[PDB]
Amino acid sequence: EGSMDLPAAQPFAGLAEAEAVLTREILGALLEAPLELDDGLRRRWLDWLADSAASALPSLDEALRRLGWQAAGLTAMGNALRGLLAGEQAPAALLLDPWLAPQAVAARLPDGREALARLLEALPTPAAGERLRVAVLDTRAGLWLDQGMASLLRPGLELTLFERSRVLLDAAATRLPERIVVQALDDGLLPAEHLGRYDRVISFAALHAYEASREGLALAAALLRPQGRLLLVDLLCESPLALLGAALLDDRPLRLAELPSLLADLAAAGLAPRCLWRSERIALVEALAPGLGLDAAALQAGLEQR
Numbered sequence: 001e002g003s004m005d006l007p008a009a010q011p012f013a014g015l016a017e018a019e020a021v022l023t024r025e026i027l028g029a030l031l032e033a034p035l036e037l038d039d040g041l042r043r044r045w046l047d048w049l050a051d052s053a054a055s056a057l058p059s060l061d062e063a064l065r066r067l068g069w070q071a072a073g074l075t076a077m078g079n080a081l082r083g084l085l086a087g088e089q090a091p092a093a094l095l096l097d098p099w100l101a102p103q104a105v106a107a108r109l110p111d112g113r114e115a116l117a118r119l120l121e122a123l124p125t126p127a128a129g130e131r132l133r134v135a136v137l138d139t140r141a142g143l144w145l146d147q148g149m150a151s152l153l154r155p156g157l158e159l160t161l162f163e164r165s166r167v168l169l170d171a172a173a174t175r176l177p178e179r180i181v182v183q184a185l186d187d188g189l190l191p192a193e194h195l196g197r198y199d200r201v202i203s204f205a206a207l208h209a210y211e212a213s214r215e216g217l218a219l220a221a222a223l224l225r226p227q228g229r230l231l232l233v234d235l236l237c238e239s240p241l242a243l244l245g246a247a248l249l250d251d252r253p254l255r256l257a258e259l260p261s262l263l264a265d266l267a268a269a270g271l272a273p274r275c276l277w278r279s280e281r282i283a284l285v286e287a288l289a290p291g292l293g294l295d296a297a298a299l300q301a302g303l304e305q306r
């Protein structure tokens with residue numbers, strides 16, 4: 001059911017150039033103190049200069065006028081990244097920071113704010129006067145939702161935050177407002193009493209950070225209320241800043257998807273999509289789930305039956 005006709009007009013290569021100049025600026029921050037990296041990444045930071053900036057991608061400080069973070073936000077990035085690496089606090093301190101966490105940087109720089117704002121919509125709940133139930137799967141430390149928080153919150157809304165961690169969700173529950181419910185995929189695993197619960201489920205700039213899209217999509221499909229809507233965005237291009245802000249993990253870039261590949265995976269997940277905005281930078285997608293015939297009460301009946 002894999003429909004796509006994507007509006008690719010709000011994207012332009014000047015967003016990538018803007019990020020590549022932001023790469024020039026944050027390279028120009030950490031390359032004054034790259035000794036706190038490992039040597040494999042310290043060489044790769046010289047290669048990340050080579051693969052961006054005045055080497056491969058020369059462009060104006062107009063970048064910082066595009067990106068929505070000025071040189072003051074970038075100063076917080078450069079300084080926090082030095083403080084992180086001096087203490088050897090990688091990976092976790094990369095995630096525990098809005099200026100560095102791969103999705104939280106995505107949530108402004110590759111126009112993932114505009115993606116976050118559209119993904120914050122498709123939630124008719126206060127206008128419907130209706131209990132619209134939502135999960136986030138890509139939560140981690142949550143510091144991307146922070147950037148939409150003031151209208152991710154809506155009347156009628158029910159919202160719950162998920163990830164494969166206790167620590168990063170205790171972090172999220174702290175720094176995002178405590179009126180949002182928080183639920184780990186505790187030790188990598190969903191409590192089944194949530195199944196069929198959420199009229200919507202959210203992924204954001206971390207679908208690559210599942211071991212396949214087939215992991216996250218299939219968790220979402222049944223965590224969704226039957227015929228609910230997946231709400232999704234991801235990095236498809238690895239951002240020139242994510243060449244720093246994700247590869248600091250020294251995890252594989254081979255994680256990232258192409259949009260037709262995602263639509264095929266999403267069709268394998270049986271969801272029926274529309275891809276909608278921010279494209280190769282950050283592709284917004286929504287998709288209708290099937291009638292699974294599956295909810296926590298249906299599973300309870302699956303006991304009572306047998």
